């Protein structure tokens, strides 16, 4: 805000004068005037004497003034320069300018309180001046006047027919002129005529000036324009046609153009121009389609013909250009256009690709309110139905949004547009063929008429503003939900993956983590389904091997449940009640259900809790009343208290899923869809409560109307846990339709009987499951499932009478293990007719087969495992080799390449023999696959029986980020090494813990090791307690300075049969600062894990990008890094990562080099060690292209990467360790345009 | 507003009770309470005995209940309705109504400022009690809890994934339902809750009603839910096809669906539907387009063939439809579904035609500012000039505004672009021929490349 100084030098020379400013530093400003015209004056200022920044193009680069002859006298007090037509005089002290003509009339002037600054000028004038410039309007703007007498609008071009721009001027005789990009403009009427640079405007600007540079005019209005272009320039003359009228047309082609310039000439109204709107060019194509002429439109535009017959005719043609450029064909295609200007760097600085539309349709609502309105549109929706439409996805029923458009459609709009279809395609089909729709609204009433509600366009993102504001996104959902069917539509869907993003529909898709958390959630909705944005994919395959995996997975789970949900569907038919609800349903009194959304239950059976968090480690889950068990890990929680439930972070495998006390739910095979086959055993689980509890099990054709007059089969089951027995009632059937079901397999846990009775006989005992499946006729068996004691019991379904079923007794199976036979697992390949087979065709299988065509490349079986807690599982794969030799498969858990197996001979194609594998396991869920991964070098080629996996691992762990944390501790990626997903810090403040639920099979004394990290130099200690017992002490030895160390502290510990507490916290006498990372539990000596094989930090790149890793990057000098990690779900279509979210690439749009590097000790040297990765590279072929292992003491040793477009193996065995270290690399010397990706790199010991 | 008079007449007649009450005229108000389950009554209120409207769409027009045999005790004041599940008491002087359960418990009440009256319905109860119902949330709203415990919000079916309508009920022991095409529930913690008809809502309103019918729930949430489908309806069941994993798209032929399937049905991940967007259809085209395979994306759909080999691989299609037509075609000409549907008044009431857009494409703004990139622009429009165009109309020069997509160009963009056909075009033609050029917006120096200033869209 201050002004300039006191003049210390006036320099005259010609028509200049410079003048030097005291500021109080030994810099002074500098003020250059320069007299241009006898009516023109420059003026620079130079705050501190710097140089001045290059003027804006404002100004004409080319300007040129004669020698005005000026008079300069710096003789005195003021200082004055004058021409004929102006006085200009500068008083000294301190510096100010007055302007005056030269009869000494004062035009303007800098008042006593500030002029020129830093930032811009500041003049003042008479009060009654009339003010010109400045402005101009927009075409969507009140248009006011001329004057700019109280003006604050930003000079800027702006928009839509806007002009402005740092220039004002008045009829009193002056103007001034700053040269900007944009800036504030100042006028009031107190006088003042003021210009400020200030911020950043709304249009942006890219030409700073340290200076200020403004010209000030005097005259008559003419003379200031005149003035005004010889500074920023005249204006070239246009075509002498350019004063003739032009018609300009949008909608137009060559006859329609042809036929206008008769009409003119015929009627002898004169005209000398057409301008074409977007139908003169190719709009939209590739290969610079919006700068090429449209020859369907304009076929004469081939040659120059269009154009001389129209000269001849007296017409010149105009056309429109948008600065911009199409980077998309119809097909989804990148343009050339988009890769010359990506390339050469053209796009506009800030404005990323977006969505537009050309060709504007005309269009107007229907009424479905009306019956012969809805017998219209039913009649020409018939010949749609014939062909293939036989469900109505009935958008936009609600409200229009369209520029001046903005209809709303009434509240039964929906249920009336649903009305039109229902009522005509029941009739039409004669009751045959059942309705199904979606809308995006309900109101009541609407569900006559077969209707489900989807909520809309929601965002791709986790929560409302993660990514933006204008929609909700994932975490929102649960809410939406349970409000509906708060109204009664309970028949509830929405887009999984989401719809919207920034940018519409050129907008990222979901990350790898966001996709596979939402289809988890999905799976356990009504209405499931994916939806993406125009052009945008949504397949799981895509988005990378866990999303797949994990969505593949929880499919299997959905489509088991079958049966029990289909019961709901027919519940909704007679109450309104359907697969989900809230708590507070089942729990009106209970006020922490009362809001309680982020759990629900589908069914009345099972309580359902997603992992919605972005990197969530653990869920604090409510659980109302009861006694409810674990779906999938097997252990019990007592009801009405909100638990600690520890997540796996990095495999995303988990769907916290609890099954209530008294739970009946009937489960079958899986199937691709839903009447792929029938299905003649239907199982049931039963877990019974004290109380008697039913479910009627319901089956009817699945596809018409017949149900409504009694054309459906149910059958009443129901269970209770007596004092010393479990009673389950199997009803008689009930309805006219003769169920697929012939044979139901009960399995009633918490119970392993020593007997089973039924109408007062025993039945006949088997020997396990297997024999039981394979008897006709009923009887049980027992066993030992995830949840603990199992019986079996296998009976008739749909008998006309009644059936008590009494399990007595208790004789536990002593079983090691679980087996699972691989031929009623999962089997996939390539393609559907090249997966693996089922086969009974040689002799020595258990079960009812054995697995084959394992034999082209990508075939595989996969196998759904719970296991009670995370570690090492010795999984036992039951196998057959008649080739003559060994033979390879992998072997993936949780979408993680875990081993190479090598298989032998076992003599023929009916001799079975074993291998046994150590398995990184989760609690919870597994995903085990056997595969011929032809790309990581494996030979298939084998066929297999069964897998067989312990009910105890070998070896436990715990991770630190999923326990419970307290008093400060927290999670974090901002150190090396770690292990899973994170690691604990914090433990700093007393009252600092992580606390651990341990699971222990017996009562006994058990072995600890605590991977821990102290980098403070010295020892320190935190408290171990135990099931809330006496603190012992956790002395914690420090390697050093540094935090990128992880050691083991081995301990012992005393544990009770079942759920333990162990807690590791700073009570008052310890030090605490230590990090925390996992703890491991054996009845044995504790030996290296299966999950931490690995000697690389960040080996997947799934650390957040925030935080550095032990990886390296180099490229030549001055070259831009071609270097990033991301998950690649920018991409149209996605390129996901090969595992989790994230994967390195190197890209450039240019030649470039490139790599990336990390140096590890190896814990043994002379030593054999191995290193893997996913590489996926793609379009221009490299010069070179390979992973890179040296520094090891041998020579470097090398591994092409190949250019196929897809994820292979790389794998360098036989790195002979002598150095201590390990450089582990990869490389890429391209001409440009070359993409790859790299991922899960594992350098590991070699057996 | 009035609440309801002495009640002077009292005619029960098996499930039935009519109430005459003093309005201080020779039309007396009539009160229909009906008892259609032991937990459920219908409350007609009809203003001078006039005649009843017809009920809303909301109401399922075949439903019917077995007799109840309810207790109707006209004796004394209060009269008294009585079921094993609910007592219904109205005081006599002036009448308002009571719920309470079988047990006596009082559930809510119609205060003595007023209960019901010609624009709709007024209760109170326990100031603690959780509310629900009423209304969800939108893709565009800031998205709330379950809770209606201070709720003003109206009831209506909304937009974008919304829903809503005239029913209120509590985890304490009731429901309220009223007959309504739209309205304005209202509660708070003081303990009310209220429901009426209020001005024409937002959305318009097409059913309008004389009286005031409602319905009180009594029970759990199951059991009320129950009920409220007894009054609205039940569900259809629909295909059992619908309970599995469907794939909806836009931007989809026969051929990429043929891919995806093979891809879902390779893998083992279970899938039943495909969902189609207007890929499927000949929008825009004349003779119900809108209503038609698109045979140019689905080749098969000329006949039901495509239908059936889907069938064959476990699928089902779904199709998108919008309650609109397209009343002129790609040429401007009328289509045969106008005529139709003009002739005929199917038409939206109070919706004219409009200009709507369909066909996306992906853009990216160019940066003028830079040498390299006006020499590559004028190099792409040499051909274009050869052939005709010698005037540059350059538009959007100045602002993009597409959904989530608002950038601006910057000052010198208009001056920038115009330099690039200038400079181009006079040297490409050795000065030869004069450059004209239009643009919608102006800044200093921009007059320099020989461009005018049109303004804009009026
Ligand atoms: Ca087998
Ligand atoms: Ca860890
Ligand atoms: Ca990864
Ligand atoms: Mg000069
Ligand atoms: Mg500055
Ligand atoms: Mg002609
Ligand atoms: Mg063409
Ligand atoms: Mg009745
Ligand atoms: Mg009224
Ligand atoms: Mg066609
Ligand atoms: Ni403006
Ligand atoms: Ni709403
Ligand atoms: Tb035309
Ligand atoms: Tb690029
Ligand atoms: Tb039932
Ligand atoms: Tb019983
Ligand atoms: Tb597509």
Same mark, same amino acid.
């Given at each position: 805000?201050?002004?300039?100084?006191?003049?210390?030098?006036?320099?005259?020379?010609?028509?200049?004068?410079?003048?030097?400013?005291?500021?109080?530093?030994?810099?002074?400003?500098?003020?250059?005037?320069?007299?241009?015209?006898?009516?023109?004056?420059?003026?620079?200022?130079?705050?501190?004497?710097?140089?001045?920044?290059?003027?804006?193009?404002?100004?004409?680069?080319?300007?040129?003034?004669?020698?005005?002859?000026?008079?300069?006298?710096?003789?005195?007090?003021?200082?004055?320069?004058?021409?004929?037509?102006?006085?200009?005089?500068?008083?000294?002290?301190?510096?100010?300018?007055?302007?005056?003509?030269?009869?000494?009339?004062?035009?303007?002037?800098?008042?006593?309180?500030?002029?020129?600054?830093?930032?811009?000028?500041?003049?003042?004038?008479?009060?009654?001046?009339?003010?010109?410039?400045?402005?101009?309007?927009?075409?969507?703007?009140?248009?006011?006047?001329?004057?700019?007498?109280?003006?604050?609008?930003?000079?800027?071009?702006?928009?839509?027919?806007?002009?402005?721009?740092?220039?004002?001027?008045?009829?009193?005789?002056?103007?001034?002129?700053?040269?900007?990009?944009?800036?504030?403009?100042?006028?009031?009427?107190?006088?003042?005529?003021?210009?400020?640079?200030?911020?950043?405007?709304?249009?942006?600007?890219?030409?700073?000036?340290?200076?200020?540079?403004?010209?000030?005019?005097?005259?008559?209005?003419?003379?200031?324009?005149?003035?005004?272009?010889?500074?920023?320039?005249?204006?070239?003359?246009?075509?002498?046609?350019?004063?003739?009228?032009?018609?300009?047309? @949008?909608?137009?082609?060559?006859?329609?153009?042809?036929?206008?310039?008769?009409?003119?000439?015929?009627?002898?109204?004169?005209?000398?121009?057409?301008?074409?709107?977007?139908?003169?060019?190719?709009?939209?194509?590739?290969?610079?389609?919006?700068?090429?002429?449209?020859?369907?439109?304009?076929?004469?535009?081939?040659?120059?013909?269009?154009?001389?017959?129209?000269?001849?005719?007296?017409?010149?043609?105009?056309?429109?250009?948008?600065?911009?450029?199409?980077?998309?064909?119809?097909?989804?295609?990148?343009?050339?256009?988009?890769?010359?200007?990506?390339?050469?760097?053209?796009?506009?600085?800030?404005?990323?690709?977006?969505?537009?539309?050309?060709?504007?349709?005309?269009?107007?609502?229907?009424?479905?309110?009306?019956?012969?309105?809805?017998?219209?549109?039913?009649?020409?929706?018939?010949?749609?139905?014939?062909?293939?439409?036989?469900?109505?996805?009935?958008?936009?029923?609600?409200?229009?949004?369209?520029?001046?458009?903005?209809?709303?459609?009434?509240?039964?709009?929906?249920?009336?547009?649903?009305?039109?279809?229902?009522?005509?395609?029941?009739?039409?089909?004669?009751?045959?063929?059942?309705?199904?729709?979606?809308?995006?609204?309900?109101?009541?009433?609407?569900?006559?008429?077969?209707?489900?509600?989807?909520?809309?366009?929601?965002?791709?993102?986790?929560?409302?503003?993660?990514?933006?504001?204008?929609?909700?996104?994932?975490?929102?959902?649960?809410?939406?939900?349970?409000?509906?069917?708060?109204?009664?539509?309970?028949?509830?869907?929405?887009?999984?993956?989401?719809?919207?993003?920034?940018?519409?529909?050129?907008?990222?898709?979901?990350?790898?983590?966001?996709?596979?958390?939402?289809?988890?959630?999905?799976?356990?909705?009504?209405?499931?389904?994916?939806?993406?944005?125009?052009?945008?994919?949504?397949?799981?395959?895509?988005?990378?091997?866990?999303?797949?995996?994990?969505?593949?997975?929880?499919?299997?789970?959905?489509?088991?449940?079958?049966?029990?949900?289909?019961?709901?569907?027919?519940?909704?038919?007679?109450?309104?009640?359907?697969?989900?609800?809230?708590?507070?349903?089942?729990?009106?009194?209970?006020?922490?259900?009362?809001?309680?959304?982020?759990?629900?239950?589908?069914?009345? @059976?099972?309580?359902?809790?997603?992992?919605?968090?972005?990197?969530?480690?653990?869920?604090?889950?409510?659980?109302?009343?009861?006694?409810?068990?674990?779906?999938?890990?097997?252990?019990?929680?007592?009801?009405?208290?909100?638990?600690?439930?520890?997540?796996?972070?990095?495999?995303?495998?988990?769907?916290?899923?609890?099954?209530?006390?008294?739970?009946?739910?009937?489960?079958?095979?899986?199937?691709?869809?839903?009447?792929?086959?029938?299905?003649?055993?239907?199982?049931?689980?039963?877990?019974?409560?004290?109380?008697?509890?039913?479910?009627?099990?319901?089956?009817?054709?699945?596809?018409?109307?017949?149900?409504?007059?009694?054309?459906?089969?149910?059958?009443?089951?129901?269970?209770?846990?007596?004092?010393?027995?479990?009673?389950?009632?199997?009803?008689?059937?009930?309805?006219?339709?003769?169920?697929?079901?012939?044979?139901?397999?009960?399995?009633?846990?918490?119970?392993?009987?020593?007997?089973?009775?039924?109408?007062?006989?025993?039945?006949?005992?088997?020997?396990?499951?297997?024999?039981?499946?394979?008897?006709?006729?009923?009887?049980?068996?027992?066993?030992?499932?995830?949840?603990?004691?199992?019986?079996?019991?296998?009976?008739?379904?749909?008998?006309?009478?009644?059936?008590?079923?009494?399990?007595?007794?208790?004789?536990?199976?002593?079983?090691?293990?679980?087996?699972?036979?691989?031929?009623?697992?999962?089997?996939?390949?390539?393609?559907?007719?090249?997966?693996?087979?089922?086969?009974?065709?040689?002799?020595?299988?258990?079960?009812?087969?054995?697995?084959?065509?394992?034999?082209?490349?990508?075939?595989?079986?996969?196998?759904?495992?719970?296991?009670?807690?995370?570690?090492?599982?010795?999984?036992?794969?039951?196998?057959?080799?008649?080739?003559?030799?060994?033979?390879?498969?992998?072997?993936?858990?949780?979408?993680?390449?875990?081993?190479?197996?090598?298989?032998?001979?076992?003599?023929?194609?009916?001799?079975?023999?074993?291998?046994?594998?150590?398995?990184?396991?989760?609690?919870?869920?597994?995903?085990?696959?056997?595969?011929?991964?032809?790309?990581?070098?494996?030979?298939?080629?084998?066929?297999?029986?069964?897998?067989?996996?312990?009910?105890?691992?070998?070896?436990?762990?715990?991770?630190?980020?999923?326990?419970?944390?307290?008093?400060?501790?927290?999670?974090?990626?901002?150190?090396?090494?770690?292990?899973?997903?994170?690691?604990?810090?914090?433990?700093?403040?007393?009252?600092?813990?992580?606390?651990?639920?341990?699971?222990?099979?017996?009562?006994?004394?058990?072995?600890?090791?605590?991977?821990?990290?102290?980098?403070?130099?010295?020892?320190?200690?935190?408290?171990?307690?135990?099931?809330?017992?006496?603190?012992?002490?956790?002395?914690?030895?420090?390697?050093?300075?540094?935090?990128?160390?992880?050691?083991?502290?081995?301990?012992?510990?005393?544990?009770?049969?079942?759920?333990?507490?162990?807690?590791?916290?700073?009570?008052?006498?310890?030090?605490?600062?230590?990090?925390?990372?996992?703890?491991?539990?054996?009845?044995?000596?504790?030996?290296?894990?299966?999950?931490?094989?690995?000697?690389?930090?960040?080996?997947?790149?799934?650390?957040?990008?925030?935080?550095?890793?032990?990886?390296?990057?180099?490229?030549?000098?001055?070259?831009?890094?071609?270097?990033?990690?991301?998950?690649?779900?920018?991409?149209?279509?996605?390129?996901?990562?090969?595992?989790?979210?994230?994967?390195?690439?190197?890209?450039?749009?240019?030649?470039?080099?490139?790599?990336?590097?990390?140096?590890?000790?190896?814990?043994?040297?002379?030593?054999?060690?191995?290193?893997?990765?996913?590489?996926?590279?793609?379009?221009?072929?490299?010069?070179?292209?390979?992973?890179?292992?040296?520094?090891?003491?041998?020579?470097?040793?090398?591994?092409?990467?190949?250019?196929?477009?897809?994820?292979?193996?790389?794998?360098?065995?036989?790195?002979?360790?002598?150095?201590?270290?390990?450089?582990?690399?990869?490389?890429?010397?391209?001409?440009?345009?070359?993409?790859?990706?790299?991922?899960?790199?594992?350098?590991?010991?070699?057996?």
């Amino acid at each position: 805000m201050a002004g300039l100084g006191n003049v210390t030098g006036a320099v005259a020379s010609g028509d200049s004068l410079t003048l030097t400013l005291d500021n109080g530093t030994s810099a002074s400003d500098i003020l250059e005037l320069d007299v241009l015209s006898e009516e023109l004056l420059r003026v620079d200022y130079r705050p501190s004497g710097a140089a001045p920044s290059p003027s804006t193009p404002m100004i004409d680069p080319d300007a040129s003034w004669d020698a005005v002859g000026a008079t300069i006298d710096t003789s005195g007090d003021p200082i004055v320069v004058t021409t004929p037509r102006m006085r200009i005089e500068i008083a000294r002290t301190p510096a100010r300018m007055t302007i005056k003509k030269a009869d000494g009339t004062t035009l303007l002037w800098e008042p006593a309180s500030g002029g020129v600054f830093e930032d811009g000028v500041r003049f003042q004038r008479g009060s009654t001046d009339n003010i010109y410039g400045i402005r101009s309007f927009n075409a969507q703007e009140d248009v006011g006047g001329l004057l700019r007498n109280s003006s604050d609008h930003p000079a800027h071009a702006g928009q839509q027919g806007d002009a402005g721009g740092p220039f004002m001027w008045s009829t009193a005789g002056y103007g001034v002129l700053v040269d900007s990009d944009g800036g504030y403009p100042y006028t009031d009427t107190t006088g003042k005529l003021e210009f400020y640079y200030g911020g950043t405007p709304t249009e942006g600007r890219r030409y700073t000036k340290t200076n200020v540079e403004y010209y000030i005019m005097v005259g008559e209005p003419k003379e200031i324009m005149a003035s005004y272009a010889q500074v920023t320039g005249t204006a070239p003359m246009l075509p002498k046609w350019s004063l003739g009228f032009m018609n300009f047309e @949008w909608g137009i082609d060559q006859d329609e153009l042809e036929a206008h310039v008769d009409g003119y000439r015929a009627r002898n109204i004169p005209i000398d121009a057409f301008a074409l709107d977007y139908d003169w060019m190719d709009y939209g194509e590739d290969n610079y389609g919006e700068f090429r002429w449209n020859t369907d439109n304009f076929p004469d535009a081939a040659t120059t013909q269009l154009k001389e017959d129209m000269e001849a005719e007296g017409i010149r043609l105009i056309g429109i250009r948008k600065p911009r450029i199409i980077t998309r064909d119809f097909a989804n295609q990148r343009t050339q256009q988009y890769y010359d200007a990506d390339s050469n760097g053209y796009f506009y600085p800030g404005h990323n690709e977006y969505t537009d539309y050309f060709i504007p349709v005309t269009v107007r609502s229907f009424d479905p309110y009306q019956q012969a309105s809805r017998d219209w549109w039913w009649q020409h929706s018939i010949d749609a139905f014939d062909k293939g439409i036989v469900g109505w996805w009935n958008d936009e029923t609600d409200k229009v949004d369209s520029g001046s458009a903005q209809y709303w459609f009434g509240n039964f709009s929906t249920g009336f547009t649903s009305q039109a279809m229902y009522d005509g395609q029941r009739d039409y089909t004669n009751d045959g063929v059942r309705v199904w729709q979606t809308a995006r609204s309900y109101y009541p009433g609407a569900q006559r008429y077969a209707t489900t509600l989807w909520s809309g366009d929601i965002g791709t993102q986790f929560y409302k503003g993660e990514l933006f504001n204008w929609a909700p996104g994932m975490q929102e959902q649960p809410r939406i939900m349970l409000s509906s069917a708060n109204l009664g539509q309970p028949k509830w869907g929405m887009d999984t993956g989401g719809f919207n993003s920034l940018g519409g529909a050129s907008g990222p898709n979901p990350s790898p983590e966001l996709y596979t958390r939402w289809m988890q959630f999905g799976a356990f909705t009504p209405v499931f389904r994916v939806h993406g944005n125009y052009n945008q994919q949504r397949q799981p395959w895509l988005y990378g091997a866990t999303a797949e995996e994990a969505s593949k997975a929880v499919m299997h789970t959905r489509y088991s449940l079958l049966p029990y949900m289909y019961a709901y569907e027919r519940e909704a038919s007679e109450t309104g009640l359907g697969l989900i609800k809230p708590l507070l349903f089942d729990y009106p009194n209970d006020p922490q259900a009362a809001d309680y959304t982020e759990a629900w239950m589908f069914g009345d @059976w099972l309580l359902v809790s997603p992992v919605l968090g972005e990197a969530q480690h653990s869920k604090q889950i409510y659980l109302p009343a009861g006694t409810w068990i674990d779906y999938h890990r097997g252990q019990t929680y007592s009801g009405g208290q909100t638990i600690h439930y520890p997540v796996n972070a990095d495999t995303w495998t988990d769907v916290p899923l609890f099954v209530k006390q008294g739970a009946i739910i009937p489960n079958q095979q899986v199937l691709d869809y839903v009447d792929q086959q029938s299905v003649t055993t239907v199982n049931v689980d039963i877990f019974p409560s004290a109380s008697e509890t039913s479910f009627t099990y319901y089956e009817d054709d699945g596809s018409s109307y017949d149900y409504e007059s009694g054309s459906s089969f149910e059958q009443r089951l129901a269970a209770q846990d007596l004092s010393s027995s479990v009673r389950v009632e199997v009803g008689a059937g009930s309805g006219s339709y003769t169920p697929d079901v012939q044979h139901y397999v009960l399995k009633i846990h918490g119970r392993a009987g020593s007997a089973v009775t039924a109408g007062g006989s025993a039945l006949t005992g088997y020997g396990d499951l297997q024999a039981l499946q394979a008897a006709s006729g009923s009887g049980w068996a027992s066993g030992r499932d995830i949840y603990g004691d199992v019986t079996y019991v296998k009976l008739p379904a749909a008998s006309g009478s009644a059936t008590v079923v009494e399990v007595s007794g208790s004789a536990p199976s002593a079983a090691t293990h679980a087996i699972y036979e691989v031929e009623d697992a999962s089997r996939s390949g390539a393609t559907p007719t090249t997966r693996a087979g089922i086969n009974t065709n040689h002799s020595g299988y258990s079960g009812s087969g054995f697995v084959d065509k394992l034999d082209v490349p990508g075939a595989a079986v996969t196998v759904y495992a719970n296991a009670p807690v995370s570690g090492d599982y010795p999984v036992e794969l039951r196998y057959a080799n008649g080739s003559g030799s060994a033979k390879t498969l992998s072997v993936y858990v949780n979408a993680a390449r875990v081993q190479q197996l090598s298989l032998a001979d076992t003599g023929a194609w009916s001799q079975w023999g074993t291998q046994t594998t150590t398995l990184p396991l989760t609690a919870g869920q597994n995903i085990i696959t056997y595969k011929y991964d032809s790309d990581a070098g494996d030979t298939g080629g084998v066929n297999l029986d069964y897998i067989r996996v312990p009910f105890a691992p070998t070896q436990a762990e715990y991770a630190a980020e999923s326990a419970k944390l307290w008093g400060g501790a927290g999670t974090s990626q901002d150190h090396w090494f770690y292990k899973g997903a994170a690691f604990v810090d914090n433990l700093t403040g007393v009252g600092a813990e992580a606390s651990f639920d341990v699971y222990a099979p017996s009562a006994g004394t058990y072995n600890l090791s605590l991977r821990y990290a102290n980098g403070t130099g010295s020892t320190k200690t935190l408290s171990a307690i135990v099931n809330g017992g006496a603190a012992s002490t956790v002395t914690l030895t420090s390697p050093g300075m540094n935090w990128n160390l992880w050691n083991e502290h081995t301990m012992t510990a005393t544990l009770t049969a079942g759920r333990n507490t162990i807690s590791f916290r700073r009570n008052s006498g310890n030090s605490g600062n230590v990090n925390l990372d996992r703890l491991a539990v054996s009845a044995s000596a504790i030996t290296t894990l299966a999950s931490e094989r690995n000697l690389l930090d960040n080996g997947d790149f799934e650390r957040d990008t925030t935080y550095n890793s032990n990886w390296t990057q180099w490229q030549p000098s001055g070259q831009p890094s071609a270097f990033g990690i991301d998950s690649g779900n920018a991409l149209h279509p996605p390129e996901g990562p090969a595992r989790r979210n994230q994967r390195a690439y190197f890209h450039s749009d240019n030649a470039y080099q490139q790599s990336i590097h990390q140096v590890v000790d190896v814990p043994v040297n002379n030593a054999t060690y191995r290193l893997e990765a996913k590489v996926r590279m793609k379009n221009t072929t490299p010069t070179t292209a390979r992973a890179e292992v040296q520094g090891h003491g041998g020579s470097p040793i090398y591994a092409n990467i190949s250019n196929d477009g897809v994820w292979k193996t790389i794998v360098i065995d036989n790195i002979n360790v002598t150095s201590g270290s390990v450089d582990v690399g990869f490389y890429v010397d391209s001409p440009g345009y070359t993409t790859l990706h790299i991922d899960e790199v594992t350098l590991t010991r070699a057996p």
